[model samples]
Target: ALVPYAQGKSIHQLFEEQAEAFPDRVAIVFENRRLSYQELNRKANQLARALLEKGVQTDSIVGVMMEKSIENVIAILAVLKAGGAYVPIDIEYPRDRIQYILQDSQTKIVLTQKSVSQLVHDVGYSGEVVVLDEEQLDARETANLHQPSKPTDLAYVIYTSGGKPKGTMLEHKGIANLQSFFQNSFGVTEQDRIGLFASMSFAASVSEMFMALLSGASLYILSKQTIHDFAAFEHYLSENELTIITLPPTYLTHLTPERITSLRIMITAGSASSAPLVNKWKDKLRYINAYGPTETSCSATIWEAPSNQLSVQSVPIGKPIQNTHIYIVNEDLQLLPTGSEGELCIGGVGLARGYWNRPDLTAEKFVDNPFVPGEKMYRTGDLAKWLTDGTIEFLGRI
Candidate 1:
């Protein structure tokens, strides 16, 4: 059933298409505020224009430090629209770590709120700074800014845990592929409600928000208290009639079957989802285990959990998403047999361009694919095997 072909450029363009299709539907919900697809698209355009006026050229690295909110989402899409890449700086991260990201990413500017400006104020960073708060949201003069970014430019730059040594970069093209895949895979209609729980700093959060906008679905954000109070979060989902929910395995372990039954689709990623967790929810809900890293631009593979068969181990990572290719190679760099465990090598559209300015590290991990002529592959460092059914069964770390 896999379609052999389709074409698209960036995630933002997909949003434009969806906005045209369903302009008045709720696109993003933050706090008590809800924006329609058309409205959210315009706001993203404004932010992109603002950055362009600030001289943020294509592929320019930008940093953002803000609490989870509507502004954070807008800022992210705007960066992509401006043809620049965004580096998410977790405001909750230690000041030392935040400073290191600013320095390491070679960021040209940062967009944050005045309430959180302390994180960037005395950091001695040589970059421009912009604030997005209620005061600036309605200023018409601010709209007199720049235009959208080029499609091939970097969309957002995200850091991995353990900081500098392994953070990866993502581009607009990869993000676009995710949106297209999401739109097709989920068959997301304008009637679907998308719930967002992760922070914009995380790649999953970015993908969920963007996917909703591009697919013409509604997105709802929860309060900090609601997220911490599981019962309240569940209540909100049911009350809102939410149709889609996304959570990593680490968080899914905390939810009950009743909560799982509320969603039409439950997407689990981030850390590995143990087989026990999948079996527990398979009967109550349609679950999908998504696999990919920060470097893979959110998700490169997805497996629809079997409703009849209960799995007790972590499900296979599945197959390469649209236009993506996965290679299982041994230590000798030889292609392994289908069932043989080896490093999970990723290639094709979803792979990030490379680590920002880390040419040496980029050169080491990203290598030319001998298996595929003239293509490059990124080593996932995780071990996997291809089952006879063609679904990949993840083993363990490489």
Candidate 2:
């Protein structure tokens, strides 16, 4: 699902050049809060040095257990800059689940703002918790630090939504690759303001967050108050002049299209995307059906209608993005002929490393690609088939 121009750089490193190029452009906005590119970068670098002093390095796991806020964005940047993989713990998750992730990931240092810092304590993580609002960073040296992380170094560990959450270790390169794909597919630029609605725990946010930050586009973090209130959310989108948004399939139906006039592109995933939704919105603007498991780094395949062409009942998941190869394989992992129904296996640079501490499941799911020599391929649980036209038809989860 990914191949990018920046193979050697970290995902955050892609944002660095954008920061320098768009120093004066607004980088983030949430309610009354706003941070310019120069301002956000400087603060992230400052906090990153603080984490560096705390002994963070490449592949280090740091808990980013914070609410959806500007400081949360800074903490994510800071952790990566310090060469640590940030584990995002969405505060809304129950206490048991939260504690499970903190313990399971072995996150040594936690970064949180003052408001959500108590949530970390409530979850009972014994690790050192660094509160952004209270802890003073290395403010003296605010310049961007050296990018110590390689593309293969861990960027973040996002937990799967399974009954027992399994932390999926994703590399910075995969995210860098994903952001590049998003930028090109959505026609993103500094002029586009993206609505950041995905939760910290969701993998899709990687595309939304970095797509904005790396492309020099402004990110608008939708608040709990606004997102829950449909009228307020539509007003907020229109007021912010948001150009793009990615959300749950049903959530897109809540908005009256005419209300958010500035919206140009809409992306939906996490459920069966249908033609009713496509034909309704695609004519007005670009609408995409994104399909992939978290292990595949969010969207492994994207389906976009051709110039408002109507779609079938179940929209096609389309084809694999760049650097990705999809194969319809039988239960034995043997390749199946085209147009034959089988499991969907994705082979690409976009795949995550594996499940953290779940080696058995990792080996079973992400197995050796017999056709591609030593390369690994992810066995996406969904059943699918290749249309003769080359698009992939998602045949529901097995």
Candidate 3:
């Protein structure tokens, strides 16, 4: 099922529309910092102009290696506003890993604050590094500008944390599609305060940030310590009065259901969660189990149990969200009948173009869809089966 409004729009364009609608509304909340929609947009516009003047163009890869703060948020927006795709590098990453990503992505501009500028220089990176705390960015124009980044153009390239760290190229339409799915699944209202716990380097971060910003919701960015210390995280959630949160099941267990009454919805992903965890919190708030890899644009399937039928032993991965198609196929790549275990394949807008520049791997992993003409489907190397209840039950890797 193709979603029309999100079919061709870029993430930045949709965010601009939200900015226009809620200019005076609160958009971002960091430690001791709050930025209104208009304020954040203007700042991003200014930095975008500066990035453009420094030779960033459509589809250009920019390195974002900044601290986890408001500055990092601004840099991400500015890069997208300039019609460039950002490759996020964790500020705490090893020097060798940072250098590898920068060189591999061929990023021309490295965005960072003065505090992290020494890290970039010390890595022996020869690319242009823009320090956000410096005057170099603020001297630019504040007027908004749009580059012709087609829906198919690269929005961001997320690298895997595993053995080789392969970068996966995700398109604008994929995010736009996911945005629509997010809004449709759990309506994001202007009054809602969303929580963002995932790191920028991770794909889920895009969903958390954009789902809040694009829908005019206030985003409360939490610190690493807050997530690490479950007690502090519960305190932060209740204190901020956050409306929605998506975290791993294990982390969710640390937070008592009674302590976080502010959370209206709780989504568990990244791994399977037990029904006990769901049953405990189901009565308190809307509970959902979302499943997908980074290659699926942060989310693909959502398992939201229908009300009045909450009695279940295990959690399902649910059906495909808007514009996404799921299939369980045998080893020969043929579709298997329902209830038969096989490899899970994902096809739709959410599917990433493929691993960045890794043609060999991409060719091997992504194959032509047998059911749909002119569509690329990703062979998720995982096992799943369609349950008799018409839901998917993930059986893990082959």
Candidate 4:
């Protein structure tokens, strides 16, 4: 099914529409603090105006380096509201890796908390550092700044590991389509309580943020340390009653079926999954296996466990998602017959623009799609084969 979305609205515009629709609803729950949509919107506006005063404008790159908290969320949204694409830097990442991303992205300013301010300087990033905690939000104008952007404008840059690290440039159009598809696929609504479990640098975090906020759902921020302990994490989910969550397959194994009875939907990805894992809670709620590289804006394909299939040997990666097209092609870019192994090529609205400031590498990976005139498709180097059932089965990466 094709999922439709408004083409001109930027991410911040979509967020503002939701905030207006549900002004009093709680939008974020972080530790002891809860921020209503109105409050969150107000804070984001203040910071956005402050960023505008600092020379942030359309197409500028800004780095957001902070630990997981409410302040981090506010910083991310404020950058977008100021018409700048944010590069999220996890505090725990090695200093060299952090420096590489900041320099490669050509970041104009970095937003950090007081504690991590030294870390930014240690990386030798000479850009202006804005501390969210120290900034006087009260003194800044709370009125929303007028944003100049389009759907094709860069929204954020997410880095992924290959031989060397590469940053993917994701646009507002691609993410808007993804959020529409995710909400429609899962029937997400304002009543749902969603948990964010992925690290800020991971694409899963991007998915969780846009999906929850765009649908007017309450997003509960979980600390990375809490996720490392199974018992503690299970209790946290139970206490908060998170209705939806997305986890990697490795993390999913640490959870038991009985402990997560409150989750209406669970999604796993980043690695291959097993039948036993999917069957653990298939009867209680929706269990989905999603597959995609960071270059594709989160997920390109998804497979939901069939209610009747209890323990199959392998789980298919399934068909292309809404507004996405998956092609299994040979080296010559010719489509292969079903059951033939070949590389996977992804196209459509979910396709990312390209790598950040690496046109040579981008051209090497993203090529013109012969099937669709003038359109480009990402060559996912991953090997897969199309099944007779119209789904693709994952093979090893090339």
Candidate 5:
């Protein structure tokens, strides 16, 4: 059964409602620092107002270059609250790649830290730089700021790596839909603590942020080193009492039932999960195999393994998510018979607006949807076949 699509509210609107409902509840936790809903809201408001004062207008693109921290989260929320879309540039990325993303996105303002301030200049980006230092944010007033952004407005643009680097523009509608589907499907609640383990540059970060925040759940910010260390990562999960987590299948192999006792739902992506790993963990917790491309707003399909079923040859990506439609087609662009391999195409509220400022590339990748009139579908480069059970079997990429 398809879930009803509800539209009309911006991401900031949802976040603001949560902030007001639970002003004193802790919303974010970082190393030795905790921000209540009220505090986080105030800090984001202050930064939003400051950015507005700096000439940021509706739909403006702002670049963010920073490591994972509370300030990093504040910067993202502030940009959205100020009616501006953020383009995140990974600090660890090559300077040339960062410069290319900044320049290509036409980002007029960049939010960074003082430690890496010189790198921005070295990249030849002449934009207004806002450093996340204590003095600037703490000095600003803690009043809320307003901006005019609609559901269709671009929320964030994340660049993907391949033959040619291009930024995919994701709108508020797509992300808001994902959040709703996530909460409804996964049952995220205030009691659930989500781990923010993905890097800021990856699309998974979008999933980690909004799904937790808008669901009224607490988000714990962990450093890369902490997540990579098997012992430290398991300890962090246990200490934080994290209920939900999404990690790559490669990373999921490091965990055991003894290491993470509090985790209730574990989502694995990036690569197929071997039957042995799924069988080993399925009985202990809800193990989900999620699949999607960056163009589909993090995840388009999710399969929750049955507790009783011990093993299988491979894990299917499951069915289409709420309001999302997937089609398996051959070279002729016609639907392939069930159990036949073909290119996987996706269409729905999750479809991106397309590559930023690259009309040719956008047209090449995002084609007219034949199944749905007057709609677009992204041709994912992955090869897959539809199973009789209505799930998708992942084959190697085309």
Candidate 6:
């Protein structure tokens, strides 16, 4: 049965709800410092006040150039609280690339650390650059305001890789929709601890991190060394008792079998998880092969390997989540038979309305939905076929 329609509350509202649910519970872990839900919310609120004081409006594009840390999390929630969309710039990227992104997104302000601030400055962006250092945020609240952010607003913009410098703007409502999907499918709880494996600039990581905060789960931030040294990452995984891990196939391939012994659920996206990795790890953990472009607000399909059932041919990507519909159609937009192959189109509460300022590009991908009367569907470019088990099995993109 489909869950009733209830749009996820604003990101700020999510923070407030989680704070009320577990004010003292640890929400994030970075290096040696930990912040409780209450503390995290307060910091985000303070930063929200700061952003507002700087005259950022509801739809303002706030550029973020920083590493994956608590400060990044704070900046993300702060943008939400201020009713502004965040444009993330990976610090690991080349300066020329970063400059192109800032200019392309039309960012009005940027939040970065001192070291990176100079880089943004050298890029010669006309926007105001706000330092995200602790001292700066602790200076004081200068704005008297508390406006509830709406779900339909823009949540964040993530620049896609290997593309022609294109970006995907995730709407605030879509974030809530993905949260709803995860809560239903996984029953994610506050007891679970998730590893933030991907860079913050990547859209996939955003969904994983948001799931932790929405469910009051403790998010464990890992360093690059941990991931590179698979043994060390396994040790930390066991030591921290992390239950859920959201990582790509490349990262998961590095883990030893023993390292995943304590894992309850393991999700892989960004690239396909090969059959060997799936069959190898399914016994001790629930292996989910998730599929979706960043434009679909994180993920659209999840393939859960059955306990006794295993094969190397292909795996089902499962059905659409609550409020989401999938169509396997041919080139002419005609629906294909269950076993027939065609492009997979997605439509639901989670589809982002448009890119930040690229209307022409947005119109090219998002098309009129045949399944739903008044809604639009994202033509997911990828090809797939429906399995006998009523699940969709993905074939590579067309």
List ranges where model 5 is wrong by over 4 Å. 139-141, 270-273
Q: Candidate 3: which stretches are off by over 4 Å?
A: 270-273
Q: What tens-digit string does per-residue lDDT give for candidate 4 at 337-361?
A: 9999999999988778899878998
Clashing pairs in 6: none
Cα lDDT of model 1 by residue, 159-201, tens digit:
8765354467777767767666876787777788888888777
Alpha-carbon local distance difference test for all models: 0.76, 0.84, 0.85, 0.85, 0.85, 0.81
Candidate 4: stretches off by over 4 Å: 270-273, 308-310
Better of 3 and 5 by TM-score: 3
What C-alpha lDDT, on a 0 to 100 scale, does residue 52 get in candidate 5? Answer: 83
Tens digit of per-residue lDDT, candidate 3, span 1-398:
45654666888898898999999999999878999999999999999888888998888999888877887888899899999999999777899888788878888888888888888888888988888888565566777797777888888999876767789998888888766777778876788898888888888887789889988999988988888888899999999999998888878777788888898888886334477777677778888888888898978798875546656688889989888899899989898888899999999888898998799899888899988989888989999999887889999897
Clash counts per candidate, in order, are: 7, 0, 0, 0, 0, 0
Per-residue error for 325 in candidate 4, Å, reads 0.7
What does candidate 2's lDDT look like per residue over 1-398, in tens digits?
23455678887788888999999999999889899999999999998888898899989999887888888899989888888888898789899988888888888888888788678878888888888889766444898888566898988888867569899889887777766677677788899899999876677776688879988999999988888999999999988888999888788877788998998888886334467777778777788888877887886898886654555566788989877778888888887777889999998888889999999999998999987898999998889888878888888876
Tens digits of per-residue lDDT for model 5, 107-183:
98999887778888788888788887733667777866657778889888999888657999988887778777877
Off by over 4 Å in 2: 1-4, 270-273, 310-314
**Candidate 5's C-alpha lDDT?**
0.85
Q: Tell me the lDDT of model 5 at 111.
A: 92
**Could you tell me which 10 consecutive residues in candidate 4 have the lowest summed lDDT?**
269-278
Error of 2 at 205 (Å): 1.8
Candidate 1 has which clashing residue pairs, if any?
Answer: 49-146, 81-149, 82-149, 83-149, 86-157, 275-312, 275-313
Against the hidden reference, what TM-scores do the models get? 0.91, 0.96, 0.97, 0.97, 0.96, 0.94
- Over 149-216, each residue of candidate 6 has an lDDT whose tens digit, in order, gives 67777888889757568778778777777666777787788888998988899888898898899888
